[model samples]
Target chain A: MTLDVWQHIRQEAKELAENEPMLASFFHSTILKHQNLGGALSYLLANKLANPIMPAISLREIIEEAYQSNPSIIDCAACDIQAVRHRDPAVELWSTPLLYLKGFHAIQSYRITHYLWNQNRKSLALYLQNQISVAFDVDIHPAAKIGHGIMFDHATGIVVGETSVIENDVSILQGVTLGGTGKESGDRHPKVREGVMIGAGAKILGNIEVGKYAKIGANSVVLNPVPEYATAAGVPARIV
Target chain B: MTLDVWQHIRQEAKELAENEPMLASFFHSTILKHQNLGGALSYLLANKLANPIMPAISLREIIEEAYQSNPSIIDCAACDIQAVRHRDPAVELWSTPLLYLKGFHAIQSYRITHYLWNQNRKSLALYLQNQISVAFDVDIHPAAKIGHGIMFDHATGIVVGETSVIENDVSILQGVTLGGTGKESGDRHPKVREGVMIGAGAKILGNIEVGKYAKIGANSVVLNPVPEYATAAGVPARIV
Candidate 1:
């Protein structure tokens, strides 16, 4: 039995708006104005990724359409918010990450682009991917597969390649790279399993398997497969 | 003896606008529309950092005033562009960083905030500082003193504390934190000397001295003083 996350977030947004006068307008427009999570998130992402090439109104239309087409996308987003709230102690209000965190924002943007990619809209997906990279400093290829309840903590300088697959309950930190080994692009990139916690600045490269519940040490480089529930650390990481 | 970096960037911007049809309007407004680097950069930064609280037009006015008051700001920016071009092999054009790089953009924004701080506009400076953190994922305190020709490569999740002093030609990679050790305030944070290169995910905590030309290894946790030209590595870093 899950709590209504949207209602909880809306309540928090109202409180914040009252408490912080400076951001009252921001809160009202970004969170309070919308009926549901989809509309609110679409507005937020559009504003962040918007440029002279693609204005906010147009981006919002595209994002809203994606949300409507793929209802599971918003389901994943809500799951992610819940994941962040449960996992990260720093998160107090549900609205905190929704309003401020680029990590959360970047992941959601990737979700829309991922939907676009599956729909055979490669160019637009690629364009949005680049925009996401520029705006959030997190680059996740449109072709990459990521499951629900994922948390990319901090998330800056994170790169997930085309062939990567991230399952549910995976938490990745800043500067982490799930990358390929060489120019041979066929089925490359790491497969991150459920409940895997990849630490900050860790590089997990090639078609390696990071097993379920495995923990990767901060700044470590992983070139090989990691077993379930194991802790991997140090340069060219080994089970520790 | 320096080439006009602004002119070089403008030329590159013109070529990019002509070649890339998608970004023609972007280039035109961001770079080609402006007469000099100051105006172009101000416009870009303003747009990126703008929100419902402070609009882009207002942020641009603030940034423009800061640039006019302290001409040295633009000089340092030009020096930074030169450093990036010379040091980074991936960068082929001067416009690349000026237009696209968040690291470069964050530093320039910091320069303006730093100026505002010195002018006793502490509140506005602090506000902009937080905005920069949210926008770039690089949290550099307004009081942090950084010299010319510095390069923050990849730049994501890089935190420079209030008392941090980074000298000329310093190169800091992603996830580097020049921070304090404890809850105590005052003159804390690392003093990075000239020609220092701090590697990715390196945490140089406390009021330690990283001597001139010293190199900190990737993912290292540095706690003590490093001698000039020395190379340090490992957790709780020691000279290598």
Candidate 2:
């Protein structure tokens, strides 16, 4: 969420800074002090995954490069931010997800890695993928195809496999897995279609298809393909 | 779990600090923040509850005092972390829940109040109890008997009324309520047995008996008693 979020967050941070002067150092450095969205995200993401392989400065530079090099990642970030704002009642401020929610942070981190993967820098991409998972508890393979306007609610325990494809306007809750059924080689992941509503702790396993506008019940284990506009539930997840 | 975790997190935080020089200060402030786990927890919990009444420094002092004054508080915190690791597959690291999960944070905070209650500091305990509810969004009474080795997955919207008894090894999901029969008092709470898995959004009202090893379906509004190892589902849940 570029300039819009950057501007929105600048204001939010300013207000929060005034309200809680005690943490002004934290708020200012994380949000207000940065030049723009890419700048702030780079700094925050770097701080989040500060590790041995790549320093936060290097990660920050990479983030800026990726955001500058590719047009879609930052655009996608804005859309993802907007999606969370529009959909989740718990989310009201643009700054909340950008600053606090790990789901958004994880996705943004993935976008950087995804950019690296597409550029054939697989090792660096893979490292970023691991960092995102470890830091946020939400893992998405660098090669996974994820669309814009996605909302990852709660988002803990989320594992999206390498070949999984998630389309636009999709909503996923905590403990949801889009993974392969068993050990497999290529393209072994679920394809989540647009506008699908996946309940918490629901598992959509294997290289199966979940159509648009479908609803999955909580704690249900889905093993087969689900059609559009249908509902699925139960251990084996039958069409309901 | 104290030294096991203390050593593990020390190593993890070390690598992170080395990797990100720009955010080394930030990492040090959180992961490598203090001398021991309790020291770090006291700092964190205080920051989390820092408000108009209790500043971060004051709360931090209180947390440190509580941990040192009584050993049970620290012991309970360790048990709670171990519980989440064992019961929830989502948790993999020693530092994950310790640093991130608000559920664990809320329970630990409640334990402090519960200790206060036992010490005949009811007025102060009730005040802290209200603060915890506001801060964490989980309303658990200081007088509620919640056992160790418990997992509160997701943890949002969870309410455990006064006099509620939660036995060990229990896994409760988000939106679950262990409350009273409307207009009742005195021991008017559910007695959650050991090894019970309470599903998301399930409500078991009144001093109803939920036998051990029971499975409660999501969104089930249970009023009657359920037996051991039984599966209950639907509105006014019946055995399935």
Candidate 3:
């Protein structure tokens, strides 16, 4: 069941700040952040339940505040930095919410940058990527491509090597490393084709391809390609 | 500034595993777990490091393994759970390596259980808390106390409640919750004492005491009193 506390709070906020434009913006932004229909519905229900005559201006202000001050965004940026540095697997595990929350904002930022990158606005896309990384700790190279509804769970110590390609519906746990094998540098990172669930502390190195629906077990180190629908485990990970 | 990658990795792991039997035990317990020291030295010095020396068998194996397999000990038989349930704004942040790892383990288990709860784990803190929850998500309760030198950088969505007391020198990040505030029972959670670090996405719940210099973080919700310097984290965690 959905936790109604957040809903209740939103509704209360709507009524308390009925005439305030800033509070209304914050409320509206918070509602737009949730991707799922259920989440959106819950937000609306809470808002309506708290105040029947909530002013649009007040709602807008609330939404704006949420966008500016959400702690989740700060945490997400931290996670991205931790991932790049390969800090610790466990750190990301406990900070899942922060990562997810930041990821939501990061994805939105990525959408804009990705469009620029694809349209040959190289400098602009790079600038945006840099900004996102500095602000949110999530570093997505301008050239990389990602799909929709992908969740980076606890995403610390996660390295997505340059030139990597991630498709849709991929759920990655903490400490997952997708990197290049050597300094040769061209197209070195693995290409994750989609619907792959990479477990915590798993490292996939070199120019390999991990097929759709493949599951990689925790702490496994992969130096080769993984076929579709396969499950792998161990140091020099073998298909299980 | 960041440390030299290889040297930094080896030094950090070596120091922690050598001084902390509990952390060493965890590494030995999992065949899939890889010590960064090995790769770190090899990469830096261009020579393969020998396998890590395993510690002699002792009570740690029994206690830690039992705790890993059965997380109920933290909730069902923990002491002083209520004190941790009450909110205290006086707790300080602690950072430590082992304490951080313990917290991560705790959170991983807790998140799994919470997900199950959403999907339907009728009874609390049994197979759901231990087997399924521990097997998947990271989380520690707020009731259990924690100690110092813990690091939680990338954790997410973890919940910790009021009654929990977390000691100094602990490092933690996103998604971890130290939860409480419900008045249904006596001493519901835990207290984390000094020098404890928690990982991300952990939950500590129930009444228990984490010792001084103990660490917990990462998607954890502790619910018990942690002893001084004893490292712990996760949903229904136990000392290693």
Give the clash count for model 1: 0
lDDT of 1 by residue, B141-200 (tens): 999999989898667788999999999999987778999889599988999999999876
Off by over 4 Å in 1: A1-48, A51-54, A58-137, A140-197, A200-215, A218-231, A234-236, B1-3, B183-185
- Candidate 2 C-alpha error for residue B188, in Å: 2.1
Question: What CAPRI-style quality would you assign to candidate 1?
Answer: incorrect
TM-score of each: 0.69, 0.67, 0.41
TM-score of chain A of each: 0.97, 0.94, 0.59
- Model 3: per-residue lDDT, tens digit, A1-240? 123423443454455236434224433444435543234432432232122344434333433333344434223333343342232222223222221234444454554556567667788667657655543445677677776546664443455766888886776755567887886768888898887878655788987999999988655688889999999876688897
Q: Fnat per model, in the order given? A: 0.23, 0.00, 0.00
Highest lDDT, which number?
A: 1
Query: What would the per-residue lDDT of candidate 2 be over residues A98-198, giving only the tens digit for each residue?
Result: 88889899888998989988987654565577557556767687889999888888787677878899999999998777865544367678899999999
Q: Give the per-residue lDDT of model 2 (tens digit) for B145-234.
A: 888878776565679999899998898866689997775678888988988988766788988889899988766778889999998876
The regions of model 3 sitting more than 4 angstroms off are A1-25, A29-100, B1-240
Better of 1 and 2 by DockQ: 1
Q: Per-prediction DockQ, in order?
A: 0.15, 0.04, 0.03
What is the alpha-carbon lDDT of model 1 when measured against the actual structure?
Answer: 0.86
